[PDB]
């Protein structure tokens, strides 16, 4: 039962990691870091526009209540399993839920705004990959939502 006071307790926990002076405030510079640590998923430009709506300098601070405003703003605009499945499905050569591990690297590191060497190394160590073949993406839909 989302956005009840229980869920706001872990939002205070994760916020307290970045309120290093301990006054109820965090910098704009880590706002994406805390939101994605809590597992809510904004894009880069979206986050930057949400920061620059608060300050044209971009370099500033946000108090705990208005951090909860920014969390609620993203929660109103949340994805779904079928919307994430659609994003993988345009790359499906067969139509069976599988995508090439070669073309996956092209999608991760050449197309779009891209994933870094660290993000690639971390994900590839857990995924255990040594090849370029077809691999199931319905797992990705479930596990990353």
Cα 44 off chain centre by: 9
Beta carbon of residue 84, minimum distance to another protein (angstroms, whole number):
10
The encoded tokens of residue 83 equal 């919307």
Q: Which residues of 37-54 are buried (b: 16+ CB within 10 A; e: fewer)?
A: eeebebeeeebeebbeee
The neighbour count for residue 16, using CB atoms within 10 Å, is 14
Beta carbon of residue 36, minimum distance to another protein (angstroms, whole number):
15
Using CB under 8 A as the binding rule, whether residue 102 contacts another protein is answered as no
Using CB under 8 A as the binding rule, whether residue 128 contacts another protein is answered as no
Nearer Cβ to another protein, position 18 or 88?
88
Instruction: Choose the binding region for another protein from 14-22, 49-57, 83-91, 135-143 (rule: CB under 8 A).
Output: 83-91
């Amino acid at each position: 039962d989302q956005l009840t006071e229980e869920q706001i307790a872990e939002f205070k926990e994760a916020f307290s990691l970045f309120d290093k002076d301990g006054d109820g405030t965090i910098t704009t510079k880590e706002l994406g870091t805390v939101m994605r640590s809590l597992g809510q998923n904004p894009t880069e430009a979206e986050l930057q526009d949400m920061i620059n709506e608060v300050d044209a300098d971009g370099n500033g601070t946000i108090d705990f209540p208005e951090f909860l405003t920014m969390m609620a703003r993203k929660m109103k605009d949340t994805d779904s399993e079928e919307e994430i499945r659609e994003a993988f499905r345009v790359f499906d050569k067969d139509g069976n839920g599988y995508i090439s591990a070669a073309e996956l690297r092209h999608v991760m590191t050449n197309l779009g705004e891209k994933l870094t060497d660290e993000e690639v190394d971390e994900m590839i160590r857990e995924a255990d990959i040594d090849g370029d073949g077809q691999v199931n993406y319905e797992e990705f839909v479930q596990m990353m939502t």
